[PDB]
């Protein structure tokens with residue numbers, strides 16, 4: 001008996017998606033994260049998702065999600081430094097795996113940032129929080145997006161200037177920003193607009209300035225392909241997996 005019973009142990013973190021608590025099983029001592037609260041969409045989308053690099057959904061207001069004891073990728077990033085290139089590559093590999101999966105089933109997260117990339121006990125990356133996620137492909141038919149979603153430093157430039165835009169390049173772009181944050185310990189701009197000096201400098205290719213200065217030429221080459229303003233000219237994920245740094249053996 002008693003297997004259905006969980007003890008709430010500590011609050012893990014907040015949100016206007018709701019407060020999150022740590023549940024531990026009375027009997028099995030298994031640990032899950034319980035969300036405390038649109039909300040029907042998050043639950044619907046969670047039910048589609050099964051992948052090593054996506055936070056696991058257990059059931060259900062109470063949402064039952066995989067507990068990631070490693071915390072946030074955000075906390076493995078030393079300010080102004082970043083992290084060791086090999087760790088960044090590994091994390092990036094796992095992020096790509098997760099995003100390839102999501103896009104595979106026609107779902108875009110829309111808010112990819114280190115705070116939403118959690119780590120398990122073995123430091124495997126898991127994409128978290130699908131409260132802003134939406135379907136972009138259904139019955140093999142793509143639907144453009146038009147609603148502003150996400151976080152300014154991470155959003156693609158077309159999202160600020162276009163009425164409609166493809167969902168996938170947006171996720172690729174924010175992944176690029178994450179890669180940057182991982183290798184330099186800083187975000188390049190407040191937002192990708194032409195009134196942002198930093199973004200202007202990047203478009204003019206002044207990579208002798210931070211954060212690009214702190215980034216090796218190989219990863220920077222990849223970033224040169226990801227952070228392209230025109231979403232049509234931007235590298236897709238299949239080609240990211242052919243990039244030289246992506247395939248560079250690192251220790």
Ligand SMILES: CCOC(=O)c1cnc2[nH]nc(-c3cccc(C#N)c3)c2c1N1CCO[C@H](CN)C1
Nearest residue numbers: 012013014020033065066067068069071115129130
């Ligand atoms: C070790 C502590 O880390 C956490 O706080 C944490 C652990 N496991 C989690 N699984 N799912 C979440 C999570 C977080 C935020 C939103 C949603 C949704 N929907 C799920 C989670 C953890 N978060 C708890 C709240 O604060 C952090 C936000 N990423 C981490």
